[PDB]
Design a protein that fits this description.
The structure is a homodimer. Chain A is α/β, with parallel strands linked by helices. Helices cover about 35% and strands about 20% of the residues of chain A. In chain A, strand 9 (about 260-265) and strand 10 form a beta hairpin. In chain A, helix 3 packs parallel to helix 9 (about 220-230), helix 4 crosses helix 5 (about 85-90) and helix 10 packs parallel to helix 12 (about 315-330). The interface between A and B is medium-sized, with 35 and 35 residues. Chains A, B: Keywords: Aminotransferase, Pyridoxal phosphate, Transferase.
């Protein structure tokens, strides 16, 4: 069973987690620091930033919900990860949409023209399902207005790892703008979803105090803590991984471009790719591949996308070639 | 250090945990079954109950906070775990207090009279800090009332497996009384605070649902999951732990009554003991021992208690030894 609806790193669990499993087991017997100082220091060192708000979460999930729980109205850029709007409704937040254009490009001028209508914005960098990165130059006009208007902008960067360019994250913008709230995660890029760990990054110390005020002390289990402390320094897990998607992502997309029902491949910047189809529905394609124990992501339930859009994960070359050779059998049988 | 303020089972991790670690590490690369079916089955098996409402907490503290939040006005038997009240005012739930008597015993008659004025009751079994169990025979008259009047009665059984005797807990009356929301944990008795795991039980399912509608999907991490499906039925550990506490709870309570500045020791049914001091304040006694690398629980800060009260853990045989001798040291120089 190849799951191409799952976007976890194929290069597996960091070798540095095994190596410090003793640390993890030892601390089983006691409550972690209620302030998590050693954890926070690792992240600070990971991001090369001090004197920032840091919020710890049982997964990035907790932070997405909680940061959105703070406002009474949000602009959601869409298509996007279902959880933005789910949580909004979950907390009675008013929702205003901004749609990516036909090319899956942000309508920056629309975000602008709506930013007095809302209390906040949440936008993916890169965005699931289309893998789009926020153009720094164009968005700076948004940042400069948000800052001015005491508006809050929440940027989900759980995938940002898969780019490698530190200049792709807005983390290096944290000091210049305390409207920025960034969400990171160790769940996708570090291959560890079962550990349940994501984080918040902001110069807005008061907004971190407000999120902490909502949470529960010791919400972070000891292994999660052990991972965040030992795995973010793991530069050689991080480089072997970049080595992967840089090449593989580039090839995968060339192979997809050859497939006949693949009408258009949208250019990704993480470990997934959004394809527009032709002469076949995502359900028909889905139900075909399922037959072969291959799962894809039908983009039916994304706002703005229909059954011609489907999302594929980008894994290692071996699984990917297998994947494509099924896509080909479908095309053949089409 | 000797932390007699901390009440974690002293025997160490259950072997059923180390003995299955590979299953924790294997599930690192996946999201758990968002249904937690294997976990859920394990809790049913453990408690020997089927067809119930099971809340699962990232710490049993989450279960306390969430349960309480569902209400407007709440009876809190005092003194008790500082967190009940913290949560109550954290969620703007009105708090009515009910006081233990001189003997740290529950005033069931006071409860009976205050019932018509609250939405819920929360009570320890056994209670922190005294260690007293609810008298299920005198309390059935409370349950009868909250059943008929649709009040909920939250029972914190975080320390209940320490009596290792089943009629003591009210899991047995879940099927009989729908008002009952019973909270258990793996922190204290199974010796794994860092793993962050607890659960809440009820025969009333709307309560179970209404509570989960406030949680995030995948809140239980894979290690805490392996532990709850594997350890809850590790009878080597349970029996070994029960042997330990039944004996040493006797030897230590005997030995405390021998010390001179301890005016009274209260009868505890778990692994901690409440002591009333004479001719020395808990502040002082805490000061005197801290120099000996012993940290004790001053109970000055529980409601209804003053600095003439201290709580000590019932620990190891050798640990309790060194501790009474450090006590005995205090009586000398007093």
């Amino acid at each position: 069973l190849l799951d191409y609806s799952s976007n976890i790193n194929p290069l597996g669990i960091p070798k540095s987690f095994l190596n410090n499993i003793d640390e993890g087991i030892k601390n089983l017997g006691v409550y972690p620091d209620v302030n998590y100082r050693r954890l926070n220091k690792s992240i600070e060192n990971y991001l090369k930033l001090k004197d920032i708000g840091i919020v710890l979460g049982n997964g990035a999930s907790e932070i997405i919900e909680l940061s959105i729980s703070l406002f009474e109205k949000i602009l959601i850029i869409v298509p996007s990860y279902a959880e933005y709007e789910i949580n909004a409704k979950k907390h009675g937040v008013s929702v205003v949409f901004s749609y990516l254009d036909e090319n899956m490009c942000i309508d920056y001028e629309d975000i602008i023209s709506k930013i007095d209508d809302v209390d906040s914005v949440i936008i993916g960098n890169p965005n699931n399902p289309n893998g789009g990165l926020i153009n720094k130059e164009k968005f700076i006009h948004v940042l400069k207005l948000a800052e001015e208007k005491k508006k809050t902008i929440i940027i989900d960067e759980a995938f940002i790892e898969f780019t490698g360019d530190p200049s792709s994250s807005f983390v290096g913008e944290i000091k210049n703008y305390s409207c920025l709230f960034i969400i990171r995660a160790m769940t996708k890029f570090f291959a560890m979803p079962g550990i349940r760990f994501g984080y918040g990054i902001t110069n807005n110390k008061e907004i971190a105090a407000k999120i902490k005020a909502k949470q529960n002390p010791w919400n972070i289990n000891c292994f999660a803590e052990m991972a965040a402390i030992n795995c973010l320094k793991d530069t050689n897990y991080i480089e072997e991984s970049l080595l992967w998607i840089k090449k593989e992502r580039k090839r995968f997309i060339e192979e997809l471009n050859k497939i006949g029902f693949i009408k258009r491949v949208f250019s990704p910047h993480a470990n997934f790719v959004l394809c527009r189809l032709e002469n076949i529905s995502g359900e028909k394609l889905y139900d075909s591949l399922l037959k072969e124990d291959i799962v894809i992501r039908r983009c039916c339930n994304f706002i703005g996308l229909d059954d011609s859009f489907v999302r594929f994960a980008i894994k290692d070359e071996k699984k990917n070639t297998k994947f494509l050779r099924a896509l080909k059998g479908v095309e053949n049988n089409l």
